[PDB]
Amino acid sequence: MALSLTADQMVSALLDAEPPILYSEYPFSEASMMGLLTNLADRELVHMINWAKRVPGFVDLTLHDQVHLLESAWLEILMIGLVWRSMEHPGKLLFAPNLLLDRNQGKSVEGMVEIFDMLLATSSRFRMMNLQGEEFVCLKSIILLNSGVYTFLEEKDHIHRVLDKITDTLIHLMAKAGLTLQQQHQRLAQLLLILSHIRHMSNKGMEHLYSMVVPSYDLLLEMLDAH
Amino acid sequence: GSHMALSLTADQMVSALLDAEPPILYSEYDPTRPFSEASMMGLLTNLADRELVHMINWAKRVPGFVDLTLHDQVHLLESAWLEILMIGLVWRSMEHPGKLLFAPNLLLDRNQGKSVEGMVEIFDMLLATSSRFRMMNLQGEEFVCLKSIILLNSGVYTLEEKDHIHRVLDKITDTLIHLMAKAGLTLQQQHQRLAQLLLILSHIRHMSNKGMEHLYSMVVPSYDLLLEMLDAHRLHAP
Numbered sequence: 001m002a003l004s005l006t007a008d009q010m011v012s013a014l015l016d017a018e019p020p021i022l023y024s025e026y027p028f029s030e031a032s033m034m035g036l037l038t039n040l041a042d043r044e045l046v047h048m049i050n051w052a053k054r055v056p057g058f059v060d061l062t063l064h065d066q067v068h069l070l071e072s073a074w075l076e077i078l079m080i081g082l083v084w085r086s087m088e089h090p091g092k093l094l095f096a097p098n099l100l101l102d103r104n105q106g107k108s109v110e111g112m113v114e115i116f117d118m119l120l121a122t123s124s125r126f127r128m129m130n131l132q133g134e135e136f137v138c139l140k141s142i143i144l145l146n147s148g149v150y151t152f153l154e155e156k157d158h159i160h161r162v163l164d165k166i167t168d169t170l171i172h173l174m175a176k177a178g179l180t181l182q183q184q185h186q187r188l189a190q191l192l193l194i195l196s197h198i199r200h201m202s203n204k205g206m207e208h209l210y211s212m213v214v215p216s217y218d219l220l221l222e223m224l225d226a227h
Numbered sequence: 228g229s230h231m232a233l234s235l236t237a238d239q240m241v242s243a244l245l246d247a248e249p250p251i252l253y254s255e256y257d258p259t260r261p262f263s264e265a266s267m268m269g270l271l272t273n274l275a276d277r278e279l280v281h282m283i284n285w286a287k288r289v290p291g292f293v294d295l296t297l298h299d300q301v302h303l304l305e306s307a308w309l310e311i312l313m314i315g316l317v318w319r320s321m322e323h324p325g326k327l328l329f330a331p332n333l334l335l336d337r338n339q340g341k342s343v344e345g346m347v348e349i350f351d352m353l354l355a356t357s358s359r360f361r362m363m364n365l366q367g368e369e370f371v372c373l374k375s376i377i378l379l380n381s382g383v384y385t386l387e388e389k390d391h392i393h394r395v396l397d398k399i400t401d402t403l404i405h406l407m408a409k410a411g412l413t414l415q416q417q418h419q420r421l422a423q424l425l426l427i428l429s430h431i432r433h434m435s436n437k438g439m440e441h442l443y444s445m446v447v448p449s450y451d452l453l454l455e456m457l458d459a460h461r462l463h464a465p
C-alpha cells in the first residue's frame with residue numbers, strides 16, 4: 001500500500017496525519033518553565049505516536065522496529081515542530097500559542113540558552129529558505145525513518161525505499177513550484193543538510209536531559225501497542 | 228593565477244579536492260614489541276594529533292575556505308574536526324568488513340574496542356556507516372565532496388559571508404550531481420543517491436557528538452589551539 005502512492009497522495013497523507021496544536025497549561029521561574037516544557041513535551045508525545053502510525057510504511061514494521069525509530073527520533077521530531085512554528089517569530093520560540101519565549105527567558109534554566117540559540121538559528125535558516133508546509137512534513141517523516149535506521153535486513157531495504165519515495169516527493173513539489181533542475185538538487189541538498197543540525201541539537205538536548213526523564217523503551221512500546 | 232571558488236567547473240572542483248587529499252598515515256609503534264605493550268587510546272590519540280596537522284593543510288585547499296575570516300575558519304574546523312577524521316576512517320574501512328582501518332598497521336575489530344569503555348558503541352556505529360558506504364559503492368570523487376560538505380556545513384548554523392558558504396555548498400552539490408550524471412544515473416536516481424549520501428552525514432554528526440561526549444568525559448582541540456595551528460600554517464614552506 002505505502003510504495004504505490006503518487007507524490008500527491010504522499011503529500012496528502014502526510015498533511016492529514018499532522019498532529020494538532022496544543023496549549024501549554026493555562027511571570028516565570030526555572031522550576032516553572034521546566035515543568036511547563038516537560039508537561040507540554042509529554043502531551044505532544046501521545047499525538048506524535050498517532051502521527052507516526054500514519055506515516056506511510058511505518059505500520060509495516062515490527063513493533064520493536066517502530067519503538068527503536070521513535071526512541072531515536074522523538075526529540076528531533078519535537079524540535080523540527082518547534083522550529084517550523086517559530087519561523088514567523090524572529091528571536092522567539094513558539095512552544096504553544098500561549099507560550100512564546102525569548103532567549104532571555106531561555107536563561108531561566110542553566111545550560112538551556114545554548115539549545116535555545118541553536119533552535120532560533122535553525123528557525124531563521126528555514127525562514128530564509130522560505131520552507132513550505134508540504135516540504136516540512138516530508139522532512140519530519142525523513143527524521144522518523146532515518147534517525148534510527150543505522151542503529152538497529154530485508155526490512156532495512158523497505159525503509160530505504162520509503163526514504164527514496166519521500167525524496168521523489170520533495171523533488172516533485174519543487175518542480176510543481178517551478179524550480180529549475182539545477183535549483184531542485186540544490187534546494188534538496190540545503191534541506192537535508194539542515195537535518196544534521198537538528199540531529200546535533202537533539203544530541204545536545206539529551207545531554208542536558210541526562211544532567212537531571214527521557215521516554216523509556218517500555219513506555220514507548222506501551223503507547224504504540226495501545227494504538 | 229587564483230581561481231575563485233564560485234567560478235570552478237565540476238571537473239576543476241573534483242581535481243582541486245582530489246589534489247588536496249591528505250596522505251594515509253601510519254600508527255607509531257615498534258612492530259617488534261607486542262600490542263599488549265601499548266595503550267589503544269595512546270595509539271589513537273597520537274594518530275589523531277598527526278592527522279590534525281594535515282587537516283589544517285587540507286582545509287586551506289578546499290575552494291572558498293580561505294575566503295572566510297580567520298575567526299570563521301577556526302569555528303568550522305573546531306566543529307567538524309571529529310566528523311572529518313570519522314568519515315576518513317569509514318572510507319578506508321570499506322574493504323575491511325567488521326574492522327576499522329585506523330592506519331595500515333592498525334586494523335581493529337569489535338572485541339579490541341571493548342577494552343576502552345564507552346568506545347564499543349562508537350565502534351559499532353562506525354562499522355555500520357562503513358558497511359552503508361560499501362553497499363552504496365561510494366566513489367573517491369564522491370568522498371572528497373562529502374568531506375568538503377562536512378567542513379563547511381558543520382558550523383554554518385552555529386552574514387553575507389554565509390551566502391558565500393551557501394554558494395560554495397551549492398557548487399559542491401552540482402559537482403556530486405555531475406559525477407552521478409557522468410556515471411549514467413537517471414535524474415530520479417541522482418536525487419535519491421544525493422539524498423542517501425546527505426542523510427549519512429547526519430549519522431556522522433551523531434557519531435561525532437558521541438565521540439565528543441566521550442572525550443569531554445576524560446583532550447579536545449580548543450578554539451585557541453586551532454587558531455594557533457591555522458595561523459602557524461602561514462609560516463610553513465610551500
Ligand SMILES: CCCN1CC(Nc2ccc([C@@H]3c4ccc5[nH]ncc5c4C[C@@H](C)N3CC(F)(F)F)nc2)C1
Nearest residue numbers: 271272274275276312313316438439441442446447448
Ligand atoms: C590536538 C589535541 C588533542 N586531540 C584530541 C584528540 N584525541 C583523540 C583520540 C582518539 C580519537 C579516535 C580517533 C583517532 C584517530 C582517528 N583517525 N580517523 C578516525 C579516528 C578516530 C575516531 C574515533 C574512534 N576517535 C575516538 C572518539 F573521539 F570518537 F571518541 N580521536 C581523537 C587529539
